[PDB]
Amino acid sequence: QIPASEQETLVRPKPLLLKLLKSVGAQKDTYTMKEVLYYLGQYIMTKRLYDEKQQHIVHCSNDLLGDLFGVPSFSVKEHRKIYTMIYRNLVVVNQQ
Ligand SMILES: CCC[C@H]1N(C(=O)c2cnccc2C(F)(F)F)CCC[C@@]1(Oc1csc(C(F)(F)F)c1)C(=O)N1CCN(c2ccccc2OCCO)CC1
């Protein structure tokens, strides 16, 4: 019933975030929070959404990531903010 681990919470991304994750090789409909962070990472890296000079800043004002997170840019170091933005794009599910 209860996840391991917060990072092992099972989630079902909402349609647009699911679309985003599947665009970078994610084959699932249910993910752990760790997996969502991993695939978002694949997305940022393949689409080169980071600042070449300041790699901790993601620039996403003209990308689906920006539309879903609701920000033009954000710092990868601000975990609290990033979790808030991800949570709005998913639903928590049970381990069955
Ligand atoms: C450090 C090496 C791996 C990371 N990485 C880079 O930092 C990077 C490397 N070179 C150039 C530019 C970048 C980057 F733009 F992203 F900053 C490359 C992609 C994967 C990479 O970053 C991201 C994945 S999701 C993501 C976000 F929030 F923007 F959407 C960013 C990554 O896996 N982590 C691990 C997860 N972590 C994190 C973020 C938010 C909340 C909690 C978190 O961790 C808690 C433990 O799980 C961020 C770092």
For residue 50, what are its two tokens?
């980071």
Quote the number of domains for the chain: 1
Distance 7 CA to ligand 1 centre (A): 14
Q: Residues 6 or more apart from 59 whose CB is under 8 A from it?
A: 49, 50, 51, 72, 73
Tell me, what CATH number does 73's domain have? 1.10.245.10
Structure obtained using? X-ray
Q: How far is CA 54 from CA 38, 39, 40, 42, 78, in A?
A: 20, 21, 18, 18, 14
Ligand 1: which residues within 6 Å by Cβ? 7, 34, 37-38, 40-41, 44-45, 50, 55-56, 58, 76, 79, 82-83
Q: At what angle do helices 33-46 and 79-87 cross, to 10 degrees?
A: 100
Strand order from edge to edge, sheet including 90-92: 31-32, 10-13, 90-92
* Contact assessment for residue 65 and residue 58, using Cβ atoms and an 8 Å cutoff: yes
Nearby residues of 75 by Cβ (< 8 Å), 6 or more positions away? 56, 57, 58, 81
The count of other CB atoms within 10 Å of the CB of residue 13 is 24
Q: Which domain holds residue 91?
A: 1-96
